[PDB]
Amino acid sequence: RKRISNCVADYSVIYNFAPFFAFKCYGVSPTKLNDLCFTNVYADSFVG
Amino acid sequence: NHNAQALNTLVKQLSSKFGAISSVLNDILSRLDPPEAEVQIDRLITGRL
């Protein structure tokens, strides 16, 4: 688990990797992400 | 008293989601794609009518 805050992200270059399995981004559509603010962002990683 | 109560209830009814992400048009417009914005706006319209 990693928490990121108090920073500005490009939100457009993170696509330079390979296409992923699925984009089930509930709520905000993952194309209108550069214009709105949030409070805090988390990132959890694991390996069905 | 009745004429004030009816108008107060009508005004207060504007803060109900009726089933949606949010009860404010601007946030829905600036947060989501048009295909889902249509559904949200339709839900709000059906709520208010």
From Swiss-Prot, chain A:
Quaternary data: Binds to host ACE2. RBD also interacts with the N-linked glycan on 'Asn-90' of ACE2. Cleavage of S generates a polybasic C-terminal sequence on S1 that binds to host Neuropilin-1 (NRP1) and Neuropilin-2 (NRP2) receptors. Interacts with host integrin alpha-5/beta-1 (ITGA5:ITGB1) and with ACE2 in complex with integrin alpha-5/beta-1 (ITGA5:ITGB1). May interact via cytoplasmic c-terminus with M protein. May interact (via N-terminus) with host bilirubin and biliverdin, thereby preventing antibody binding to the SARS-CoV-2 spike NTD via an allosteric mechanism.
Protein name as catalogued: Spike protein S1
Gene from which the chain derives: S
Function comment: Attaches the virion to the cell membrane by interacting with host receptor, initiating the infection. The major receptor is host ACE2. When S2/S2' has been cleaved, binding to the receptor triggers direct fusion at the cell membrane. When S2/S2' has not been cleaved, binding to the receptor results in internalization of the virus by endocytosis using host TFRC and GRM2 and leading to fusion of the virion membrane with the host endosomal membrane. Alternatively, may use NRP1/NRP2 and integrin as entry receptors.
Swiss-Prot record, chain B:
Superkingdom of the source species: Viruses
Coiled coil: 1-41
Physiological role: Subunit of the fusion protein that is processed upon entry into the host cell. Mediates fusion of the virion and cellular membranes by functioning as a class I viral fusion protein. Contains a viral fusion peptide that is unmasked after S2 cleavage. This cleavage can occur at the cell membrane by host TMPRSS2 or during endocytosis by host CSTL. In either case, this triggers an extensive and irreversible conformational change that leads to fusion of the viral envelope with the cellular cytoplasmic membrane, releasing viral genomic RNA into the host cell cytoplasm.
Name under which the protein is recorded: Spike protein S2'
